[PDB]
């Protein structure tokens, strides 16, 4: 009944996990000094919740399909394993090695069936087997009822969902990061609770962000180039760093998973879909999607996000390769810090003063003449940027009160030509929702109707030669 996770016994992340999963018992047991321990604990608990609310005697399709993780289980899994990354050769060999060693000792699970199953695929690479295949998500022919996506950012959501629906799938799940910052068109951001930093490729030579590197220069009054600039805008290329591992991604595919509340898929067959969020913890979310045959209802095309803690996005000036440039960054703030600065932000404060209070609030707070220690701390490398954002917010609010307009009318002065104001900070307080407009009607699907096997002869020989030596 208890669930064990591989994090420190004195960590401050235990309380966050317990509140997110109140139906389990969580105890720590550390056996590895991993640099991404927090990011793996959330995923481990998510699968147990997912596989508990679905009845047995049902087939589950796995898209990421790391076969080693699903070896010791009672549910029926169909792993879809293409060969398109440098991770794949290592995982396939590991799967074969574990299967051979596990033969005989374990009898409850279908170890014998899996071993014979893998040999059949090795004979000819074009057989759809109950537990394994070498096709993509589109080209798979096996029919099931439940589909599971785990940390998948390399597919188009509307296209992938449609191909699963026509095979008779009525339920889907998605576990991954929050896509809200990418809908605001930011440049760099961070997830301080999971030691994750991401930045655009164009600003990889910055000086004062989470993911950058620069050199030492004495200065130069004059230097030329080979092309004109005058514009710096985000492009379709970003880089992710989860503790110590690098992952390149694209903006177009990330934004495709920010599905609205209700949408219609129209093709040869029509379906009606819904999307809900069931679990949220400081950046990780779990989404459940249901699909039904037919086409009736109406759509509005809006997406709603609920904020349990503060969310900031401001404008900062930084030196990129010796040149001063300005761009936007975003981050998260704990709810306790936000609540304790309500009265301070009633006036105008300098960035220096705001920094001093933030450092003090991070250690102690006085209540009714009594001093107590704060148990909700935040990383110290994000304080300078947060303090700057708060100062800008306070000044903007004061200028709005000093200029009051009439009720029910607007001053467009003739030929209109109204004036626009300047905004330098967006601040979303706890218990506040954000609404955005997206597309809710899809009718275009394209498929590369060709099958190519990336499997190689030397890899086939090693796998066959590895499985031959049965214990």
């Amino acid at each position: 009944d208890p669930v064990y996770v591989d994090i420190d016994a004195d960590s401050a992340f235990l309380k966050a996990l317990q509140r997110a999963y109140p139906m389990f018992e969580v105890e720590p047991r550390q056996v590895t000094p991993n640099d991404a321990a927090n990011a793996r604990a959330f995923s481990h608990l998510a699968i147990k919740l997912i596989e508990q609310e679905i009845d047995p005697d049902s087939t589950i399709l796995d898209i990421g399909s790391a076969p080693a993780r699903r070896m010791m289980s009672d549910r029926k899994y169909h792993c879809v394993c293409p060969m398109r990354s440098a991770e794949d050769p290592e995982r396939l060999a590991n799967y074969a090695r574990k299967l051979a060693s596990a033969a005989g000792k374990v009898l409850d699970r279908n170890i014998s069936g899996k071993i014979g199953d893998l040999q059949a695929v090795m004979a000819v690479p074009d057989t759809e087997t109950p537990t394994f295949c070498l096709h993509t998500d589109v080209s798979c022919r096996q029919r099931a009822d439940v589909a599971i996506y785990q940390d998948v950012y390399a597919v188009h959501a509307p296209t992938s969902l449609y191909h699963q629906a026509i095979k008779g799938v009525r339920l889907a799940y998605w576990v991954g990061f929050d896509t809200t910052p990418f809908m605001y068109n930011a440049m760099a951001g961070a997830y301080p609770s999971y030691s994750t930093n991401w930045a655009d490729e164009q600003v990889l030579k910055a000086k004062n962000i989470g993911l950058c590197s620069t050199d030492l220069t004495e200065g130069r009054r004059g230097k030329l180039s080979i092309m004109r600039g005058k514009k710096l805008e985000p492009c379709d290329r970003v880089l992710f760093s989860v503790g110590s591992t690098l992952y390149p991604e694209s903006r177009k595919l990330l934004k495709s998973w920010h599905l609205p509340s209700v949408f219609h898929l129209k093709g040869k067959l029509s379906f009606t879909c819904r999307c809900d969020t069931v679990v949220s913890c400081e950046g990780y979310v779990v989404k459940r999607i249901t699909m039904s045959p037919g086409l009736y209802g109406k759509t509005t095309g809006y997406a709603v996000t609920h904020h349990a803690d503060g969310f900031l996005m401001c404008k900062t000036t930084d030196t990129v390769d010796g040149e001063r440039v300005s761009f936007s960054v975003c981050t998260y703030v704990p709810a306790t810090i936000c609540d304790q600065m309500t009265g301070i932000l009633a006036t105008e404060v300098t960035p220096e003063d705001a920094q001093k209070l933030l450092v003090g609030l991070n250690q102690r707070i006085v209540v009714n003449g009594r001093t107590q220690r704060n148990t909700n701390t935040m990383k110290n490398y994000m304080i300078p940027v947060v303090a700057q954002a708060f100062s800008k917010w306070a000044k903007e609010c004061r200028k709005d009160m000093e200029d009051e307009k009439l009720l029910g009318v607007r001053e467009r002065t003739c030929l209109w030509a109204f004036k626009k104001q300047k905004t330098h900070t967006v601040y979303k307080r706890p218990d506040t929702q954000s609404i955005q407009k997206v597309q809710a009607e899809f009718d275009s699907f394209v498929v590369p109707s060709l099958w190519s096997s990336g499997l190689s002869i030397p890899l086939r020989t090693r796998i066959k030669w590895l499985l031959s030596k049965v214990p």
Binding site: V366, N368, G369, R370, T371
Partner: protein
């Protein structure tokens, strides 16, 4: 301090409120003192400043400071009122109170006797010291190199829950200039501000843990308040006081600030720019202060062991200004519930005290004097609960009680020059603005519980600070058994008999006059005598307030009918003979400015000058 200090400032007032013009006691009514509200005026200051430049002999300057200080007082009121908006209240109808008055005292004539040559006075005093105190009169053989000798030997300390930087523990002496004394009493100089002295002062270990706020602690506190209300108070005011709370009011702040002096108001004004609200001021943070003077008593003990170092724990400056307007009301309510035969020195003067005990003490009467200083109040948590229970019964408003309670728990102290951190548990002595009041309440409660009903049937009882005197009580085994529940050295008791063993109270003697037949209180001559042998720091110009204080004290000593009694009282206490000549020597010293210059000498400079 209490009656009078060395400069004649004291803690008591100088206005009589307990005097009547009839030969019998008369009950009267307690009234209120109206205070003039300060007002702001800037045009007057501008014109007076310009008129100050054109002509200013002596009084023209004084008008500027009076105008300037008056402006500061108005500004403080305006700023202070805005901070405590959530606690401010209005004036409710007051509960009347009554008090007893006594006839004026009678004194005997005084005759002045003095010598002529001031050098002979020094010789007589030196002869007196050598004959009675041989070891003290032979200590001084060289200069004052105490600082150097303290540096040569290392540092010994007994600390608990403290942190400090070892790289800043260095105690090379600085320049020291003083005047060589003439009296051969070896009174030490004040210590220097070093890290070594700070650690030596905090060599106290009171680490004791008991039940914080559990059932056994509450039971002991409940019994203590029951004894206090049953054996020392009447029942005619409790229900009325509970109905009417005490809250922060504009009149309290206006009256308080107006009573401050010039320099005190200026210091408070400098800390009003970044004014924190009342609920933001921490109540459990203190600062450490060292500047004090060593305390010496007659005898031979400072020539063998080094004396201790005194320290002050100062609270937040804003904490003692927001809530210091409720002290007057607390004093009035406490005096209303006490029995007529039980007295407290608060809100009295020297003359009022004499009139109260004028016809109560006679020769052959037993007097019990007891002090509670030698008691560890930090061991038991019930001593703090009892004070809070008494405060709640007096009618203190509930949110204010939480602020007061926060200062009686875990506190921390810091030394700014060296960055040294200290932590203490439950502590009673501190620098807050309820220290004498709580100590007086605990002193009365302890006496009431131990003595039971013997306190009610008495002629006169006086309680102040850590000292008390009770008339017609002797020492028996019943009080020893009652007080031996935990240990035996909780309190120190001494038996005294009038005209045989004079009672001691607040550094003075209680004597019965012979010509008139009334009791009176006088000061201690030996304590003064050792004090004149204290070196004077160079650059000090306070040699005129001391002469007036000595002149007043000398006159009280030479009253007819008290010379013989004073001789016997000193001998029965210190076992010393020949103090009439010393008093005569003091008389000629306090006769003129030049006669007071014979107690000093040439200036000596040490550890200074690269030559």
């Amino acid at each position: 301090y209490i009656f009078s200090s060395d400069t004649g400032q004291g803690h008591l007032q100088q206005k009589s409120v307990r005097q009547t013009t009839l030969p019998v006691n008369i009950v009267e009514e307690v009234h209120e003192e109206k205070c003039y509200p300060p007002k702001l005026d800037e045009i007057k200051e501008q014109l007076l400043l310009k008129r100050l430049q054109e002509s200013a002999s002596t009084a023209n300057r004084s008008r500027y400071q009076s105008r300037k200080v008056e402006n500061m007082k108005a500004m403080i009121i305006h700023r202070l009122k805005e901070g405590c908006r959530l606690y401010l209240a209005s004036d409710t109808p007051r509960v009347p109170s009554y008090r007893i008055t006594y006839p004026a005292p009678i004194y005997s004539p005084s005759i002045n006797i003095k010598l002529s040559n001031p050098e002979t006075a020094v010789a007589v005093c030196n002869e007196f010291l050598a004959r009675n105190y041989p070891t003290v009169a032979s200590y001084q053989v060289t200069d004052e190199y105490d600082a150097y000798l303290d540096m040569v030997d290392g540092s010994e300390s007994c600390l608990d829950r403290a942190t400090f930087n070892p790289s800043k523990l260095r105690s090379y002496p600085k320049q020291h200039s003083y005047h060589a004394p003439t009296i051969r009493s070896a009174v030490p100089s004040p210590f220097q501000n070093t890290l070594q002295n700070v650690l030596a002062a905090a060599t106290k270990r009171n680490c004791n843990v008991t039940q914080m706020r559990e059932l056994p602690t509450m039971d002991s506190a409940a019994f203590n308040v029951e004894c206090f209300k049953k054996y020392a108070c009447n029942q005619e005011y409790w229900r009325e006081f509970a109905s009417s709370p005490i809250r922060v009011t504009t009149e309290n702040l206006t009256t308080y600030v107006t009573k401050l002096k010039g320099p005190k108001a200026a210091a408070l004004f400098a800390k009003t720019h970044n004014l924190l609200p009342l609920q933001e001021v921490p109540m459990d943070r203190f600062t450490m202060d060292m500047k004090r003077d060593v305390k010496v008593t007659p005898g031979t003990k400072h020539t063998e062991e080094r004396p201790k170092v005194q320290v002050i724990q100062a609270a937040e400056p804003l904490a003692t200004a927001y809530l210091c307007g409720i002290h007057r009301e607390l004093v009035r309510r406490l005096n209303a519930v006490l029995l007529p035969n039980v007295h407290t020195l608060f809100d009295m003067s020297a003359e009022d005290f004499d009139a109260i005990i004028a016809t109560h003490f006679k020769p052959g009467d037993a007097v019990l004097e007891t002090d509670i200083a030698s008691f560890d109040k930090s061991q038991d948590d019930s001593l703090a609960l009892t004070a809070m229970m008494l405060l709640e019964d007096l009618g203190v408003d509930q949110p204010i009680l939480d602020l007061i309670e926060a200062a009686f728990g875990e506190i921390s102290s810091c030394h700014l020059p060296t960055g040294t951190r200290f932590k203490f548990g439950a502590m009673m002595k501190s620098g807050m603005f309820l220290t004498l009041f709580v100590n007086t309440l605990l002193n009365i409660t302890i006496a009431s519980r131990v003595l039971e009903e013997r306190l009610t049937t008495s002629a006169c009882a006086a309680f102040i600070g850590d000292d008390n005197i009770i008339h017609g009580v002797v020492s028996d085994a019943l009080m020893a058994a009652r007080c031996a529940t935990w240990m035996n050295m909780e309190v120190k008791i001494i038996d005294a008999v009038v005209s045989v063993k004079a009672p001691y109270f607040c550094g003075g003697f209680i004597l019965h006059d012979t010509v008139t037949g009334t009791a009176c209180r006088v000061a201690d001559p030996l304590k003064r005598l050792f004090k004149l042998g204290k070196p004077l720091a160079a650059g000090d110009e306070q040699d005129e307030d001391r002469r007036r204080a000595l002149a007043d004290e000398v006159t009280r000593w030479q009253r007819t009918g008290l010379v013989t009694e004073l001789e016997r009282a000193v001998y029965s206490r210190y076992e010393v003979q020949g103090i009439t000549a010393v008093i005569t020597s003091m008389a000629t010293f306090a006769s003129s400015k030049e006669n007071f210059k014979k107690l000093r000498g040439p200036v000596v400079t040490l550890y200074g000058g690269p030559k």
